[model samples]
Target: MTRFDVLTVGNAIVDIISRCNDQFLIDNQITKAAMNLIDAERAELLYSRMGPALEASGGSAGNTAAGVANLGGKAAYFGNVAADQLGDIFTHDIRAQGVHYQTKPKGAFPPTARSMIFVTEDGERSMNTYLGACVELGPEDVEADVVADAKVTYFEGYLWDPPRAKEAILDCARIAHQHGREMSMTLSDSFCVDRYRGEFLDLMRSGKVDIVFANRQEALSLYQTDDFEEALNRIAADCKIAAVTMSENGAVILKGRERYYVNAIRIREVVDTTGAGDLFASGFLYGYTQGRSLEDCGKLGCLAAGIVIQQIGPRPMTSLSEAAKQAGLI
Candidate 1:
């Protein structure tokens, strides 16, 4: 039997991050701290106007898969890219991190997805994405045996942005359930959750999803309730396990009648909060796959998030297993 710990499916983006001030937001007419979709022409226009950028391979679920592999776990990923420079970089980076990159790059598409991140001094980041070849991800890209081999099949809700990607995500979830593997998902961004609240509700209710990851804003938007506790209660009833993160306030893990409040890991200076939630899920899912307690899983998540936040990008500059070991996770 082919054994894998986790399998992730989502966009494969080459994040191009630049340090900019609040004025950059106004100058570019871009919303602050929100993901705005832009076309290739617009993306090039914005790139030309911005300062020098730092390139890193990233995507919500892609980062999670990288983190899992970094922590000495098995991981596989599915996403689309074009056979171009950025696409080659994205594939090499993820595979170098020890995660499987199974999606074939399209020979004639624009390129891989690209996220132009504007990082402000206050540690806030605003993102403008050009999905490019990511839109090509569809049901045919999903490998049923790969989903069945994994202990958990994880997906990012951002896949909903492109209708075809959503179909592929649902197919993977179905395959996971058929193979008795846990199916998990992350509410990638608050706006994404807002855009697909009803559909998310339907997915949760279908009993195909075993774990749900949402941040404070995402959970609030998903349930369409202002109260966090109310939203938590509703999610707990609908899903097998729900983890709601409240930034520095910590997170709450609810599974049926049992609940645990996990404290956020302490950090000296927060450089960029780009992949905080994604890395947090990585740590938590790593623990879950290893048969750790939910509380310990949260601690692992905090440690991972703490490491990523200290750096500029989502993936760590150093080895994550070493960091985890130092944090007493290994």
Candidate 2:
């Protein structure tokens, strides 16, 4: 029997989210709604300049694993953190939420990886990340049993940033496939996609990646097209299954020549857009483990994202299982 519904690997970071304004982006030379990598010095400068913030245990894949646990699915996570206070906090928070994370900490100057998320009043965000200790993750960190015992092995594009981690993910994918498991990947950020476009496309074409998750911008970059239709068709021909998110416009699901559409879930309010795609994958994968239909997976994904988007943090403030149950997703 599979030990977990999902096993995710990526950078383990502590998110520092704060509400900011559009002017802040121009003032700081930051792009709106784009993730930018910064050095330790810049990371400290932004933390000092930014207003009060909320800290949460987060990493693209980490958030998705936490979401899986939140919706009552079994998930295990793999990521690097320092043996520091922040790392301790990340470990406690993720495990406390009922997700499994067991990576030995390596040391760093900037300490654990952190993303200073600046959310504007319009619900847009600009991020400045300091990778810190995550840079030390190597192939030695991944366990064959961990990858083989899971139904699906999931990871984020951010892994490509750390050269060793890039090699590590490939090995994990190899192990998962050896066990006849599925492999899921998130494009993470468009900027990240820009950095490894050719390699990512190759990963899809080579039968290494099974399911791909992407937001509008990420998808556009992957196919090198400004036109959504062209990007859609291009990806359809390139990959087997994909979930393309369009923010408020809804999401598109593709499997072979079949196309399924899912409308975005309406929310009472929008507090933050952090982890929207992560939670969507969480709900979708949770349903997938239960053998739910593609349409239902899309619906659950939309619902999970919709719920978390209403809150200020990337992780949900309450149990998503009850909400999913009421929505008939269970």
Candidate 3:
């Protein structure tokens, strides 16, 4: 069997994002630019009150899988989605990108998870996520053979919230290591890092994760410090490769003691910042699996993320591989 370049595991969610003004946030009691977990009732109510919206397949690791596929890499995904209409949409969209997704949906479980993203003019998104079927993701859904067959296994820190998913990722990491495959993880949202700091460190120190992806805030929180240099040092020591994104300041890549800095790719307009980090991991991980130089990996990751932020949903509308060619980073 031909091996996949990246195998991703995470929550399977369909994102429903809509444009909103500043008053909408105050009226709905939603914090500006923060992800909030909601219940089924809130999900329904928000849908009713929101303006016209755009729906797309999302979820941190799911977006990464789509991104890898978009970048012309062989990718596979493992996650839980209910046997519902939204689940069908999620499956089709991801598979349409040429990602291998074979997880059987549960008919008896809750509906598919959805993130209600309210985007403001400032390119900010306040998310209200309902983790319906995502909570049902467990060890049984993870494919050990696929983990062994992939060059790299990727996971998100938010998966630690689900009882069984935490175990599943750990199990998959072990399987990948046994097969001599590399493993990487993203810090996900900064709030997620705050929730599972100790365990994230343990996963890195225990050698289960060779690469780590994080933004400036996530990196700072993981190290329990406000200093960027302090966080960078801890992150580099904890993993074999550390790529920390600094929004407009670009990204820094550290391997052993050497470091490479690259600027963020510029975009004409910033639409929605939903999948910036996820797509960034997609590019960097794809590059890593291709054995590209560390400097090029950071630059590729930056180019991919820049394109996603220029659009409204988590999934990139533009072909990231095309952007890479135009940027001469290929």
Instruction: Judging by lDDT against the true structure, name the best candidate.
Output: 3
The sequence of per-residue lDDT tens digits that candidate 1 reaches over residues 1-330 is 447899999888999999998998998999887788899899999999889889999898999999999888899999998899999999999999889887987675777899999999988889999999999999889988889899999998889997699888778887888888999999888889888888888888998688999988888888888998898889899899998888898888999989999888777988999998889988999999999999988888888888898889879777878888887878
List lDDT for all candidates, in order.
0.89, 0.89, 0.90
User: Which clashing pairs does model 3 show?
Assistant: none
- Model 1 pairs whose backbones collide: none
* Clashes within 3 Å, all models in order: 0, 0, 0
- TM-score per model over all chains: 0.97, 0.98, 0.96
Query: What stretches of model 2 exceed 4 Å from their correct place?
Result: 108-110
RMSD (Å) of each candidate, 1 decimal: 1.2, 1.0, 1.4
Best by TM-score: 2
lDDT of model 2, residue 68: 93
lDDT per residue (tens digit) for residues 43-160 in model 2: 8788898998888888889999999999999999999999898999999999998887888886645489889999999887788889999998889899788899999898999899
Off by over 4 Å in 1: none
